[PDB]
């Protein structure tokens with residue numbers, strides 16, 4: 376129905392706004408673009424599902440997210456990719472891990488404060504109907 380198309384449009388507007396707020400945060404610059412294989416040629420070898428905020432915007436715009444749960448799986452992937460690729464004790468790795476956890480935590484905190492649970496429940500019920 377349109378009403379269902381209107382629901383998913385509202386979802387996309389909401390997700391673009393959350394993603395924009397994460398992307399303009401200086402802490403998260405490293406997560407804003409895919410990893411350049413020239414800088415890190417073994418990335419694509421270790422990380423099977425690269426994810427970044429640019430890719431998340433592309434996926435919103437392609438109507439790939441029908442729920443905030445599916446969006447948060449991609450945010451979780453940005454975080455777990457960073458924990459897996461940068462696991463060492465050295466400060467460079469610890470800084471990226473802290474920034475990755477802070478991304479996950481910020482996305483979840485914005486969604487806790489600004490997502491209506493009944494809106495998410497509607498999205499989940501339309502998705503389950505398809």
Ligand SMILES: Cn1cc(Br)cc(N)c1=O
Nearest residue numbers: 405410415457460461471
């Ligand atoms: C996410 N990300 C980005 C860059 Br640039 C370099 C890394 N080692 C990494 O894990």
Ligand SMILES: [Cl-]
Nearest residue numbers: 401402404470
């Ligand atoms: Cl820095």
